[PDB]
Write a protein that binds this ligand. Sequence first.
Ligand SMILES: CC[C@H]1OC(=O)[C@H](C)[C@@H](O[C@H]2C[C@@](C)(OC)[C@@H](O)[C@H](C)O2)[C@H](C)[C@@H](O[C@@H]2O[C@H](C)C[C@H](N(C)C)[C@H]2O)[C@](C)(O)C[C@@H](C)[C@@H]2N[C@@H](COCCOC)O[C@H]([C@H]2C)[C@]1(C)O
Ligand SMILES: [Mg+2]
Ligand SMILES: [Mg+2]
Ligand SMILES: [Mg+2]
Ligand SMILES: [Mg+2]
Ligand SMILES: [Mg+2]
Ligand SMILES: [Mg+2]
Ligand SMILES: [Mg+2]
Ligand SMILES: [Mg+2]
Ligand SMILES: [Mg+2]
Ligand SMILES: [Mg+2]
Ligand SMILES: [Mg+2]
Ligand SMILES: [Mg+2]
Ligand SMILES: [Mg+2]
Ligand SMILES: [Mg+2]
Ligand SMILES: [Mg+2]
Ligand SMILES: [Mg+2]
Ligand SMILES: [Mg+2]
Ligand SMILES: [Mg+2]
Ligand SMILES: [Mg+2]
Ligand SMILES: [Mg+2]
Ligand SMILES: [Mg+2]
Ligand SMILES: [Mg+2]
Ligand SMILES: [Mg+2]
Ligand SMILES: [Mg+2]
Ligand SMILES: [Mg+2]
Ligand SMILES: [Mg+2]
Ligand SMILES: [Mg+2]
Ligand SMILES: [Mg+2]
Ligand SMILES: [Mg+2]
Ligand SMILES: [Mg+2]
Ligand SMILES: [Mg+2]
Ligand SMILES: [Mg+2]
Ligand SMILES: [Mg+2]
Ligand SMILES: [Mg+2]
Ligand SMILES: [Mg+2]
Ligand SMILES: [Mg+2]
Ligand SMILES: [Mg+2]
Ligand SMILES: [Mg+2]
Ligand SMILES: [Mg+2]
Ligand SMILES: [Mg+2]
Ligand SMILES: [Mg+2]
Lengths: 51, 76, 96, 64
Amino acid sequence: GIREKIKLVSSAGTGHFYTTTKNKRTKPEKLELKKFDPVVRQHVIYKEAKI
Amino acid sequence: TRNGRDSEAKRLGVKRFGGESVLAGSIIVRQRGTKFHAGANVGCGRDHTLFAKADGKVKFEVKGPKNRKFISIEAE
Amino acid sequence: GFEGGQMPLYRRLPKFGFTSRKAAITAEIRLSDLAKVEGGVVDLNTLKAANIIGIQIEFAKVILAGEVTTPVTVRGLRVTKGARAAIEAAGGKIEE
Amino acid sequence: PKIKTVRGAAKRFKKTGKGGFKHKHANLRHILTKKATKRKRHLRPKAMVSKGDLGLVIACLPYA
RNA sequence: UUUAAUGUUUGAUGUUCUAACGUUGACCCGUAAUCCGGGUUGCGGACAGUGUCUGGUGGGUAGUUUGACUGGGGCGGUCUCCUCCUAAAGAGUAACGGAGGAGCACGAAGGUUGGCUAAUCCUGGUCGGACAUCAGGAGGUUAGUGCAAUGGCAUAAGCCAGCUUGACUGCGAGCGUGACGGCGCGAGCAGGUGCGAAAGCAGGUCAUAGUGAUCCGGUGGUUCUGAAUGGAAGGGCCAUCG
RNA sequence: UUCCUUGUCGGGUAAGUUCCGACCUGCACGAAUGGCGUAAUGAUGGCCAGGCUGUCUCCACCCGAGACUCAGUGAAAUUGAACUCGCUGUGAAGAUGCAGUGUACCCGCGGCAAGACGGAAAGACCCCGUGAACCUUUACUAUAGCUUGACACUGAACAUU
RNA sequence: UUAUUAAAAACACAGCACUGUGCAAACACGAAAGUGGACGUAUACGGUGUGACGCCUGCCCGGUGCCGGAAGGUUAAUUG
RNA sequence: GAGGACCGAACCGACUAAUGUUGAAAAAUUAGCGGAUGACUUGUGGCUGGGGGUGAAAGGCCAAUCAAACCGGGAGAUAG
RNA sequence: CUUUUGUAUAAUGGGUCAGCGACUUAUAUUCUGUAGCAAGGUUAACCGAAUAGGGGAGCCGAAGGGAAACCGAGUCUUAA
Ligand SMILES: CC[C@H]1OC(=O)[C@H](C)[C@@H](O[C@H]2C[C@@](C)(OC)[C@@H](O)[C@H](C)O2)[C@H](C)[C@@H](O[C@@H]2O[C@H](C)C[C@H](N(C)C)[C@H]2O)[C@](C)(O)C[C@@H](C)[C@@H]2N[C@@H](COCCOC)O[C@H]([C@H]2C)[C@]1(C)O
Ligand SMILES: [Mg+2]
Ligand SMILES: [Mg+2]
Ligand SMILES: [Mg+2]
Ligand SMILES: [Mg+2]
Ligand SMILES: [Mg+2]
Ligand SMILES: [Mg+2]
Ligand SMILES: [Mg+2]
Ligand SMILES: [Mg+2]
Ligand SMILES: [Mg+2]
Ligand SMILES: [Mg+2]
Ligand SMILES: [Mg+2]
Ligand SMILES: [Mg+2]
Ligand SMILES: [Mg+2]
Ligand SMILES: [Mg+2]
Ligand SMILES: [Mg+2]
Ligand SMILES: [Mg+2]
Ligand SMILES: [Mg+2]
Ligand SMILES: [Mg+2]
Ligand SMILES: [Mg+2]
Ligand SMILES: [Mg+2]
Ligand SMILES: [Mg+2]
Ligand SMILES: [Mg+2]
Ligand SMILES: [Mg+2]
Ligand SMILES: [Mg+2]
Ligand SMILES: [Mg+2]
Ligand SMILES: [Mg+2]
Ligand SMILES: [Mg+2]
Ligand SMILES: [Mg+2]
Ligand SMILES: [Mg+2]
Ligand SMILES: [Mg+2]
Ligand SMILES: [Mg+2]
Ligand SMILES: [Mg+2]
Ligand SMILES: [Mg+2]
Ligand SMILES: [Mg+2]
Ligand SMILES: [Mg+2]
Ligand SMILES: [Mg+2]
Ligand SMILES: [Mg+2]
Ligand SMILES: [Mg+2]
Ligand SMILES: [Mg+2]
Ligand SMILES: [Mg+2]
Ligand SMILES: [Mg+2]
């Protein structure tokens, strides 16, 4: 019961976002991943933000 | 200490036995491990569910140097 | 709907959608109704006079249902592309 | 007196063409992060009421 | 630069004042009446008291709740989920039957490509010991698997490294399993992506536990709706949270 | 007030789980929800003795009122229907009614209560009902009352700032 | 004192203590007026516990309640 | 000539036993029993009203009625 | 008779007779039968020497899909 829920916001202008979990005690660094943005239909980079 | 717990039965086992005609995608056997292995025209799901990848009759065989049971679809 | 205490079906399922107030003032007209009108030219008033649509209807659409045989002049009504062909095939005329 | 519709049922079931009823799926209100996208995707479209439950729905929606 | 004091708005209280108000003080009259009212006067005096609003207190009073299973009830235990046995060689199958677990973890412990193969023991060897690292032989998985058990696992699903984000979006032939709500498996199609020379593989993790319907409400989005009209509010739809 | 417990010792009795005296090992006394004493009082609780006795050993007789018979009047609870025996077995598991068997001429009257799971009251015990009532409280939600402040009824002057 | 299964060791009691109450008293019955308390005034009245008399009545204010305190913290309507 | 003093009738009460228990009686009779100048008893009239009264307190009593009287109404309450 | 796994049961109910005594009514809705008409069917209130006739306001049906705008024998889903 330590992993907090986070959201990954797309770097594109669209407000689309994914949601996942994260252990903020062991991994304080922000999570950045390349995920598919269904609004622009491209693989852009997604950065972490608060749920 | 005290017993009295159990889990719901999972309805595993063979669903289509040898010689049965199946459509593509039909589940052949649900299993925990790979007690049966995928042969020709048979896929292995993420839970090791063997499903038919083509129409035809299912076929059980034991092959290989370890005498493992395989399931294949005789396409007809 | 009582199921002995188990959460009944109409409560364990979510509510969805909303009711449109514009759908209550919209009607559909079959091709077979175009001959019931008086005068040939059809509009909102002539359809209401012929007791084909309700008195509070503000929008009316003609659809490909039934069959039209006489030249009819549709005026101020939306017409489906299937009904538009059938009306023009019977010498009719469609004007916005 | 007229039969009164169960208003809660009217907001959850819509009558279809052949007399069936469509409804929204459950399990898609909250707690979706842990749910697989495949599972959530299969819950988006509307579904038909099963044969075993039509008796309950029809009794609650007499004017539907 | 600064400082004082006369003039002002609003509060913070107090010491006066009497004119509201109180008087279950005295006297007079209605009146041949310890009610009441009026008058005179004294004493209080903007307090007290009452109305509306408001915090506290409030079994004084009121309405109610206070589970089920159960070799009677109570007490104890139990209540959902996973694994094995009972279970009678398909599935399923009860008991307060026999044994154990779960209410997570992981941006690598996921994907892919390339490689790799244990436990234990023996022999020899600085400190070094029953047990560290080194070398050889035996052995052949008796090991390992994020965690219970079971079924699996060498083509390894076990171990290591490189590059990575498919832990993709829309779908989905066809099945499995449920009374139902549901739950599960899934080739293939479209879009876009990773790894690989390529065939290919990837829609999380060896599999099976790690979970909570609906309502109400929150946040973001939205070529939906907008009670005269244009907006807006609110609602819907999509994503997501409690 | 002591569970163990008829504690132990002493007194009383031929014999005393009670009683009286003591011991202290107070399961679990204790000082105004009072402690320990206490003359008098008590239709109060326990125990002992004298007297007295049909309380008893063990009942006997007697006098009256009923019971019994005759005349008059004349109820009640209860009641599926009855041509309404014993035993052993059986069986919704304790039989007048079933099986086997034994016994038994028909009908009263006075008696007695073993049975008819006798009569009486839809068990007070027990459990159950998402029954009820009343009671309790640091259960929940309220609320009368009590209390706080704001505003109103409610004004003037002046300090202090 | 349980009319009608309980008369008692229960209740009361004189006495004792604590506490409230300054009189338009506390308190009680009353939406209120009012009335009781009382035509009484702290040697009085109400409440509570104890229960003649005799000898006495020890320790604990942490908990709960009550009383006092007002500095600080928190905090309603109101204000905006 | 004092006393909630003593003995004991009326009077008030109700401790024991027997009887009665479809009674003579929906609480009595018989034989004994307690108080009997007092916190006594009794007549007539009055007052207190139902979540209320009254209670030397037993949840007692409030018209043979009481852990909330009786009568009418809600009312054909509801009764898995 | 009832109730039950099960009743001659010693489980319930009935002394007997006679009379009375329990699935109704209204309005909606669905299905079946039947009758009329039929891509149509039918009127309500009301008018009316009124069971006629008038009255078609309405209701149901002949089109659906979608939350909705909207489209429409298709539509929704999706960039497709
Ligand atoms: C004087 C006559 C009254 O009966 C009695 O007094 C009996 C002695 C009475 O029993 C007494 C004495 C007692 C020891 O039982 C012998 C005791 O246990 C019972 C509860 O009370 C009966 C048997 C007593 O019956 C016993 O009740 C108990 C609860 C169960 C017994 N049995 C079934 C085992 C049954 O025998 C009943 C209940 O009292 C009898 C009942 C039918 C009637 N009502 C009672 C009313 O007074 C008593 C208060 O009741 C609330 O009056 C009864 C009946 C009419 C009588 C017959 O009139
Ligand atoms: Mg019309
Ligand atoms: Mg949502
Ligand atoms: Mg209460
Ligand atoms: Mg109620
Ligand atoms: Mg129970
Ligand atoms: Mg099996
Ligand atoms: Mg692809
Ligand atoms: Mg490449
Ligand atoms: Mg695993
Ligand atoms: Mg508008
Ligand atoms: Mg003796
Ligand atoms: Mg003796
Ligand atoms: Mg002694
Ligand atoms: Mg004591
Ligand atoms: Mg005492
Ligand atoms: Mg004595
Ligand atoms: Mg006679
Ligand atoms: Mg027998
Ligand atoms: Mg015989
Ligand atoms: Mg009996
Ligand atoms: Mg009963
Ligand atoms: Mg009595
Ligand atoms: Mg008595
Ligand atoms: Mg003391
Ligand atoms: Mg204080
Ligand atoms: Mg005397
Ligand atoms: Mg005397
Ligand atoms: Mg006498
Ligand atoms: Mg005397
Ligand atoms: Mg009592
Ligand atoms: Mg009475
Ligand atoms: Mg009513
Ligand atoms: Mg009734
Ligand atoms: Mg029974
Ligand atoms: Mg049966
Ligand atoms: Mg039985
Ligand atoms: Mg029989
Ligand atoms: Mg019988
Ligand atoms: Mg019999
Ligand atoms: Mg019985
Ligand atoms: Mg009977």
